[PDB]
């Protein structure tokens, strides 16, 4: 009724859309990792490097609780690309890389994908498809001195960008003039490590700000940097929500026999979607399906004649139907359509709620592969192998003929459609009006 948006259903077979509740439960699997990540140094050391020559660290093999940084909203900005910052304690990674430095507060703008400016050009480039976060805060009280903190440096000139996550240190005369400078400095021929005159009395935009960039490596290699998530027990052969190192799904986890090579971490379907996984604690290869899928189709007389109904589970065997619908987590009036004696194996799938019959009849409702069903005596839905019409046997022999002695003048109706309703649509009055 809900599939057809109707209170009446005519005689036939119908492919029901799924309205079942199947409320499910959750399972979580993660590495046994306990080393706390060194964020309390990276965000807190006495100085960070020059923006010409920024600091870098690969982080691996640790518990990354970002909630300290998420609660420390004293950071002037904490902006993420390709990840919402809320997810960082539930998601996890193969590698993380932290880059850090100090820069003028106005000029922090440059540290994002798609930016331009002399630092974005010459000495720090993110890829424009960067996945990760930039964090920055005012550091005037620490990083301003003399009106002359000329350690915090940027390229005055040279040519071409520094490429995404390249480093450069190089110390040369840059040859801005038409002159063959060729080692000799002068006007338009100059060394290039120019830098900020940070006074502690500088106006807001003229002050130094501290910066950290986090880049996250979401590869299909093994995870190593992971949030404060706790693994559950591993349930098998039930519909569960599931999560492996942040790789989520909902479906049936099972044991499996997929012959992974030692480095192969996941198995994939034709759709290029994960369908098997290695447990990060157990090292067992598990298989995945959605929640025990099978095509539910309903065989019915008209609701005008009975509310009694039968179900065909397309593409499953009668041994597995209760585990298909998950009878453990379903309405009792629905649950009756597992087991129940009137359960029969067609070639198309398991049929439940139909009384099988050894006779053959003309096909009332079609089920598939020669099986049909009808409503009959005290009434029930019955299912049977269909009739091909009566057998007959012509009395052929080499010298015998049959000739008709009489006739009947039939009148046979035939009906054909010839035309259909002419229409037109005023597109502007339909679309806009």
């Amino acid at each position: 009724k809900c599939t057809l948006k109707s209170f009446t259903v005519e005689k036939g077979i119908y492919q029901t859309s799924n309205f079942r509740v199947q409320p499910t439960e959750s399972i979580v699997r993660f590495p046994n990792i306990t080393n706390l990540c060194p964020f309390g140094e990276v965000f807190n050391a006495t100085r960070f490097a020059s923006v010409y020559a920024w600091n870098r660290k690969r982080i691996s093999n640790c518990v990354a609780d970002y909630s300290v940084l998420y609660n420390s909203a004293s950071f002037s900005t904490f902006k993420c690309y390709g990840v919402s910052p809320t997810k960082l304690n539930d998601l996890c990674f193969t590698n993380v890389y932290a880059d850090s430095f100090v820069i003028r507060g106005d000029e922090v703008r440059q540290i994002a994908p798609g930016q331009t400016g002399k630092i974005a050009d010459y000495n720090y480039k993110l890829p424009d498809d960067f996945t990760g976060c930039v964090i920055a805060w005012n550091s005037n009280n620490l990083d301003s001195k003399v009106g002359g903190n000329y350690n915090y440096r940027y390229r005055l000139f040279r040519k071409s960008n520094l490429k995404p996550f390249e480093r450069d240190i190089s110390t040369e005369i840059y040859q801005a003039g038409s002159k063959p400078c060729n080692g000799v400095e002068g006007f338009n021929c100059y060394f290039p490590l120019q830098s900020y005159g940070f006074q502690p009395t500088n106006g807001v935009g003229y002050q130094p700000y501290r910066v950290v960039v986090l880049s996250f490596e979401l590869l299909h290699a093994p995870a190593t940097v992971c949030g404060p998530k706790k693994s559950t027990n591993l349930v098998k052969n039930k519909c569960v929500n599931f999560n492996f190192n942040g790789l989520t799904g909902t479906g049936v986890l099972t044991e499996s026999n997929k012959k992974f090579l030692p480095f192969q971490q996941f198995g994939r379907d034709i759709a290029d979607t994960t369908d098997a996984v290695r447990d990060p604690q157990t090292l067992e290869i598990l298989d995945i399906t959605p929640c025990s899928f099978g095509g539910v189709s309903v065989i019915t007389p008209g609701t005008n004649t009975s509310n009694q109904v039968a179900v065909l589970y397309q593409g499953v065997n009668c041994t597995e139907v209760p585990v298909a619908i998950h009878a453990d987590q379903l309405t009792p009036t629905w649950r009756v359509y597992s087991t129940g004696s009137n359960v029969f194996q067609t070639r198309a799938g398991c049929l439940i709620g139909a009384e099988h019959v050894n006779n053959s009849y003309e096909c009332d409702i079609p089920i598939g592969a020669g099986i049909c069903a009808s409503y009959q005596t005290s009434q029930s839905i019955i299912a049977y192998t269909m009739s091909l019409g009566a057998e007959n046997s012509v009395a052929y022999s080499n010298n015998s003929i049959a000739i008709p002695t009489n006739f009947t003048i039939s009148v046979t109706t035939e009906i054909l459609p010839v035309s259909m309703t002419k229409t037109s649509v005023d597109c502007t009055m339909y679309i806009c009006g």
């Binding site: 996550f165 997929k258 992974f260 090579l261 996941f266 198995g267 034709i270």
Partner: protein, 212 residues
């Protein structure tokens, strides 16, 4: 001394099991029927260019090839990848310094790590400063040139070491033969069998039939 790769130099492109499928991918492969340089243990191990990435292979039964050096300039002035099988271990470091200078086993280094009857194939490439190593070992009995046939190299290692490598050299054992060739960006068609294993390929750019 030139010769040719024919059909060698395939490797597993990513860390995923796929079965009974004709998957297709673009990567730095050794092209089908590409030329390669032959060498044997004399003087035959000068410094060579690394380009986008190296296919390297050696035909041996006693490990005469022992290792490799890679860098910009291999000079005691900037970081150079050192790799050495020392029989007890496989040994890896990034030093500038020629603290041992010898191009063979005698018959500020930000990273270090330690683990003609045989053909050892090795592939070296570097993406965004992530160096990647692949290999295959197979028994053989063979002519002076690479075996025309098929096998796929598994990854051994990924190293995040970031060096601007442009040059390399190989380390021997002194008081056997080897081959060198280069990777190109190519689109390949790959045949994964029932057992998660690559069994054949096509280099689409090779000829009009391969495009077909």
């Amino acid at each position: 001394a030139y010769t040719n790769s024919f059909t060698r130099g395939v490797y597993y492109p990513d860390k995923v099991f796929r079965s009974s499928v004709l998957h297709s991918t673009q990567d730095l492969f050794l092209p089908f029927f590409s030329n390669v340089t032959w060498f044997h243990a004399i003087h035959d191990n000068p410094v060579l260019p690394f380009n986008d990435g190296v296919y390297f292979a050696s035909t041996e039964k006693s490990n005469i090839i022992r290792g490799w050096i890679f860098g910009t300039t291999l000079d005691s002035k900037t970081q150079s990848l050192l790799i050495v099988n020392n029989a007890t271990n496989v040994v890896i470091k990034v030093c500038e310094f020629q603290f041992c200078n010898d191009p063979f086993l005698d018959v500020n280094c930000t990273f270090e790590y330690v683990s003609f009857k045989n053909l050892r194939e090795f592939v070296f490439k570097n993406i965004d400063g992530y160096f990647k190593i692949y290999s295959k070992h197979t028994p053989i009995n063979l002519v002076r040139d690479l075996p025309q046939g098929f096998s796929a190299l598994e990854p051994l290692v990924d190293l995040p070491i970031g060096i601007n490598i442009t040059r390399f050299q190989t380390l021997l054992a002194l008081h056997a033969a080897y081959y060198v060739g280069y990777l190109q960006p190519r689109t390949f068609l790959l045949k994964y069998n029932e057992n998660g294993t690559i069994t054949d390929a096509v280099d689409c750019a090779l000829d009009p039939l391969s495009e077909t």
